[PDB]
Amino acid sequence: KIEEGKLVIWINGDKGYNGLAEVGKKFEKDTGIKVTVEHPDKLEEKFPQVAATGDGPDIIFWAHDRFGGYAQSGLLAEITPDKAFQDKLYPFTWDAVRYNGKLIAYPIAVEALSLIYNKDLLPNPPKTWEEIPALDKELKAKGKSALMFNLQEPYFTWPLIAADGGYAFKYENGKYDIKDVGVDNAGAKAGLTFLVDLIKNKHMNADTDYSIAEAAFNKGETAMTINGPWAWSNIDTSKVNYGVTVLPTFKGQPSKPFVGVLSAGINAASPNKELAKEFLENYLLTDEGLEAVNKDKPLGAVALKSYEEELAKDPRIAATMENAQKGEIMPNIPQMSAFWYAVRTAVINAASGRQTVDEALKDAQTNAAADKHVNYKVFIYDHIRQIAIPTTNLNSQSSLEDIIDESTSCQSVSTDGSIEIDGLTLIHNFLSESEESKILNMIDTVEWAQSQSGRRKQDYGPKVNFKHKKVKTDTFVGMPEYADMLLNKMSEYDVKKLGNYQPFEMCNLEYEEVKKSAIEMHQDDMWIWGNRLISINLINGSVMTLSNDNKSFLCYVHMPHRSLLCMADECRYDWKHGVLAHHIRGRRIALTMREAAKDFAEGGELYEKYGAELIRLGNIRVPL
Ligand SMILES: OC[C@H]1O[C@H](O[C@H]2[C@H](O)[C@@H](O)[C@@H](O[C@H]3[C@H](O)[C@@H](O)[C@@H](O[C@H]4[C@H](O)[C@@H](O)[C@@H](O)O[C@@H]4CO)O[C@@H]3CO)O[C@@H]2CO)[C@H](O)[C@@H](O)[C@@H]1O
Ligand SMILES: O=C(O)CNC(=O)C(=O)O
Ligand SMILES: [Mg+2]
């Protein structure tokens, strides 16, 4: 679980986490309680997975739109400010962190996108999006460009998409109606069409992301960007003569940015809820606390009335709230993340030209009512040609029967649009029936242990605290007797791919269809386990589901009974794998192996502390 007596805090990497850690020091200096501020990548996706097992940070910072999904599953403690503390923050900020009539987080700051422009290049910024193409031709002739901003996150393109009519969910009768989505109406297509036309006409590049746009603006190479308050600190230190103003209109109408309230939720599994309440209320949500965070990266219009008064004069804040007035505060309902996931894909796919605007927004409309796999392009693995074949017969919910059908049908299909997955290897009939019987009779002489998600396990190897990087070898007395016959047979079949394999862990995983056993999508640890992950299908076959978030690809790999799978290189480091429960039939044992990581092998950094000991134990054999 979560350690008592200290506070662990998650906040995104674009916010002032170093200022927040300074508030944590003042907390530690006063209370002796250590505060540790972390900025994990994808923290907003990790928090629901680790909080639901009783783990994670005591306090999570994000915009409020994420928090209704968390609260729905019970991952956020109700917060209990007294009336005097409630009166210290603007009421509208409290309403952004209300879910089913309960306060679920503290509001910190109000954020909205603005147009940021270089006054020395562009003293009169455009009032309209429509005049940017001609603005770019003028500036292109002078070695500059008009406008660069993050095209990879729909947050930055949403103001333009909403402007002429796009919306997430209609607000009607005091509620958000999830049955009425507006991402494929005329207004949304008009705005995304304009964005895609800007890219077709080379006024923007569909690959531009947050860091590329920020550097270009901050080096003085583009006349405009679009960003929020957290970005101003980096502009300041580059001494570009910038201003902050209203976003341009589109088709005569204002751009409508989704307004975020940066918010602090308290993990429901936390045993430190009183310490978190003390920190947030009397250390962070003070003039001195907010100033420390603001001096690192600006927060926007803070929720605390006293410190906002001291900030009202700032013209950048005034422009932020002018844009906020033209947009809307985001919903916080659970479906907001499905909305964003869907719109993220439409924008990427239309901008790249892979899909037209109409079909990209038609797909996002459908998926905004949904599991981010629904948005990915689906492939089936052709084990003969050893490529993944794009298929529209399969989706993220396809049955085992449909996947098995497709994995033979796909072999007579054109290779167009196919991909290779480097380091995916499938060996169809690795074990004979009698070798499998031999191993299975040995395995069922050994005790099974209860594990996660309806699996049982036999574990041969060290106890590993992955989070603390600590290893115990008390339980590690060797590898199972059948390890040699497997390792030799791996070397005989394909020495280049499966040889020189020193098993650091062998682990049998038992699935039963009656128990709904499964294993969630994951990447296996890369601190102690090395490149090649081996899995051998005993008793029954199944499907390894592979996903690539970076590319939005979903690939089904049918693993027939007695096949060997090896996931290495790209397949191991760029993709996730898992076994969905509805792809298990009867009983299956996955006979898995990990090899040593490089830090643990004969020339690594932890070879002396752990690696040499693990090699000795892994060389001895347990008789059956
Ligand atoms: O692999 C796809 C991507 O999935 C992950 O990003 C998701 C998030 O998990 C979703 O929550 C959502 O993100 C929203 C976000 O909730 C919303 O607040 C706003 O984010 C702003 C933020 O308010 C602002 O303070 C500042 O930090 O910039 C953010 C925008 O970058 O808008 C987001 C949508 O753009 O949707 C995305 C998917 O788009 C994962 O984190 C990604 O690494 C991953 O690539
Ligand atoms: O094969 C299975 O059932 C699940 N296996 C893995 O996640 C793996 O081999 O790393
Ligand atoms: Mg795995």
Numbering used by the authors: -371 to -2, 33 to 286
From the paper:
AlkB family members are Fe(II)/α-ketoglutarate (α-KG)-dependent dioxygenases, which catalyze demethylation of various substrates including DNAs, RNAs, and proteins (Li et al., 2013; Fedeles et al., 2015; Kweon et al., 2019). In summary, we found that NMAD-1 is able to directly bind to and demethylate C. elegans actin K85me1 (equivalent to bovine and human actin K84me1) in vitro and its deficiency dramatically increases actin methylation level in vivo. Our structural and biochemical data revealed that NMAD-1 assumes a typical DSBH domain and contains a highly conserved catalytic site for the metal ion and cofactor binding and actin demethylation. The unique NRL domain and the CTD play critical roles in the substrate selectivity.
To better understand the substrate recognition and catalytic mechanism of NMAD-1, we determined the crystal structure of NMAD-1 truncation (Δ1–31, hereafter referred to as NMAD-132–291) in the presence of Mg2+ and NOG at 2.20 Å resolution. The N-terminal flexible region (residues 1–31) was removed to facilitate the crystallization. NMAD-132–291 was fused with a maltose binding protein (MBP) at the N-terminus to further facilitate the crystallization. In the crystal structure, MBP contributes to crystal packing but does not interfere with the cofactor binding or constrain the overall structure of NMAD-1. NMAD-1 is comprised of an N-terminal extension (NTE) domain, a potential nucleotide-recognition lid (NRL) domain, a double-stranded β helix (DSBH) domain, and a C-terminal domain (CTD); the NRL domain contains the Flip1 and Flip2 motifs. The seven β-strands (β8–β14) fold into two β-sheets, which sandwich Mg2+ and NOG at the active center. Mg2+ is coordinated in an octahedral geometry by the sidechains of residues His184, Asp186, and His239 (so-called HxD…H motif) as well as two oxygen atoms of NOG and a water molecule. Apart from the metal ion, the recognition and binding of NOG are achieved by hydrogen bonds contributed by the sidechains of Tyr173, Asp186, Ser197, and His239 and salt bridges by the sidechains of Arg250 and Arg256. Flip2 is mainly composed of the β6–β7 hairpin and protrudes from the surface to form a positive ‘horn’, which may also contribute to the substrate selectivity. Notably, the CTD locates beyond and stabilizes Flip2 by hydrophobic contacts involving Tyr272, Leu276, and Leu279 of the CTD as well as Pro124, Val133, and Phe138 of Flip2.
